[PDB]
Design an enzyme around this catalytic site. Structure first.
Site, PDB file in Angstrom:
ATOM      1  N   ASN A 160     -12.969  -0.768   1.465  1.00 34.51           N
ATOM      2  CA  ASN A 160     -11.782   0.089   1.686  1.00 34.51           C
ATOM      3  C   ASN A 160     -11.370   0.836   0.441  1.00 34.51           C
ATOM      4  O   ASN A 160     -10.894   1.993   0.502  1.00 34.51           O
ATOM      5  CB  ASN A 160     -10.595  -0.717   2.210  1.00 34.51           C
ATOM      6  CG  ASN A 160     -10.764  -1.137   3.667  1.00 34.51           C
ATOM      7  OD1 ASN A 160     -11.225  -0.361   4.483  1.00 34.51           O
ATOM      8  ND2 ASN A 160     -10.387  -2.357   3.983  1.00 34.51           N
TER       9      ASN A 160
ATOM     10  N   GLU B 194       4.009  -5.409   4.899  1.00 39.32           N
ATOM     11  CA  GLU B 194       2.933  -5.743   3.962  1.00 39.32           C
ATOM     12  C   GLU B 194       3.400  -6.265   2.619  1.00 39.32           C
ATOM     13  O   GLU B 194       2.718  -7.116   2.013  1.00 39.32           O
ATOM     14  CB  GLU B 194       2.015  -4.541   3.737  1.00 39.32           C
ATOM     15  CG  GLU B 194       1.405  -3.982   5.046  1.00 39.32           C
ATOM     16  CD  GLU B 194       0.616  -4.974   5.950  1.00 39.32           C
ATOM     17  OE1 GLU B 194      -0.344  -5.598   5.505  1.00 39.32           O
ATOM     18  OE2 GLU B 194       0.945  -5.097   7.136  1.00 39.32           O
TER      19      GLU B 194
ATOM     20  N   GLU C 220      -0.942  -8.393  -4.247  1.00 39.24           N
ATOM     21  CA  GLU C 220      -1.126  -9.661  -3.594  1.00 39.24           C
ATOM     22  C   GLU C 220      -0.943 -10.836  -4.544  1.00 39.24           C
ATOM     23  O   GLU C 220      -1.432 -10.809  -5.630  1.00 39.24           O
ATOM     24  CB  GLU C 220      -2.509  -9.720  -2.958  1.00 39.24           C
ATOM     25  CG  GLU C 220      -2.813 -11.041  -2.211  1.00 39.24           C
ATOM     26  CD  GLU C 220      -4.118 -10.998  -1.383  1.00 39.24           C
ATOM     27  OE1 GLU C 220      -4.692  -9.861  -1.258  1.00 39.24           O
ATOM     28  OE2 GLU C 220      -4.517 -12.079  -0.826  1.00 39.24           O
TER      29      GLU C 220
END
Ligand SMILES: [Cl-]
Ligand SMILES: [Cl-]
Ligand SMILES: [Cl-]
Ligand SMILES: [Cl-]
Ligand SMILES: [Cl-]
Ligand SMILES: [Cl-]
Ligand SMILES: [Cl-]
Ligand SMILES: [Cl-]
Length: 209
Positions: free
Chosen positions: A109, A62, A71
């Site tokens: 989430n 990830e 990110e």
């Protein structure tokens, strides 16, 4: 009764993640374990080590070996806001991008994980990129409670010996499994396999999906 410390030593962790950002430390990880007491503590030691390798490998994938806290593509941040939800996106439309060891994403989430941990990450999602103790807990939350695109939690996949493959399915399987991205399926398998070797365990079956 002897030594029942963490199955990953600090030194193994350093070998696994030679280029980690300072945000991510061995201590930070070992501190988070007690929030998920069955993680890496269930079944034989062959199994505990397998589970530790499985988690950290997926974590490696990830984050680029824990180089990235968040990110990179700012232009795509707005898409992680699912307006169809009733609690909406209070921290901002663009606030629910990937952060931390599992690159936790999407208002829904952030909400789920926060509820689980007792932390309002819907309102303060920036915590996952500012507070290591929280970031790590979000990782363990995913690993230990979420099915994702699959049918079982990554925890149970390893603990019940259903295969490292189910961890992949449950992490990004709708895009990667069933022929979608075999290269990336195999990349995850490669890092898992190296990590099982670092810890002196075996990979177990059904590595793929
Ligand atoms: Cl460290
Ligand atoms: Cl647990
Ligand atoms: Cl990786
Ligand atoms: Cl906004
Ligand atoms: Cl902290
Ligand atoms: Cl905390
Ligand atoms: Cl893909
Ligand atoms: Cl590779």
């Amino acid at each position: 009764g002897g030594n029942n410390g963490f199955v990953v030593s600090e030194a193994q962790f350093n070998q696994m993640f030679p280029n980690r950002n300072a945000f991510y430390t061995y201590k930070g990880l070992t501190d988070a374990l007690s929030a998920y007491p069955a993680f890496a503590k269930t079944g034989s030691d062959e199994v505990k080590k397998r589970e530790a390798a499985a988690f950290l490998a997926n974590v490696s994938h990830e984050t680029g070996g824990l180089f990235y806290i968040k990110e990179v593509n700012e232009a795509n941040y707005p898409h992680y806001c699912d307006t169809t939800q009733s609690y909406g996106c209070p921290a901002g439309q663009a606030a629910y991008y990937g952060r931390g060891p599992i690159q936790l994403s999407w208002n829904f989430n952030y909400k789920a994980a926060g509820d689980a941990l007792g932390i309002n990450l819907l309102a303060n999602p920036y915590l996952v990129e500012q507070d290591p103790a929280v970031a790590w807990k979000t990782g363990l939350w995913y690993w230990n409670s979420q099915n994702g695109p699959g049918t079982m939690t990554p925890h149970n996949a390893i603990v019940n010996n259903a295969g490292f493959g189910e961890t992949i399915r449950s992490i990004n399987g709708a895009l990667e499994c069933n022929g979608g991205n075999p290269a990336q399926v195999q990349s995850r398998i490669n890092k898992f396999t190296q990590f099982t070797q670092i810890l002196g365990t075996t990979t177990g079956p059904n590595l793929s999906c």
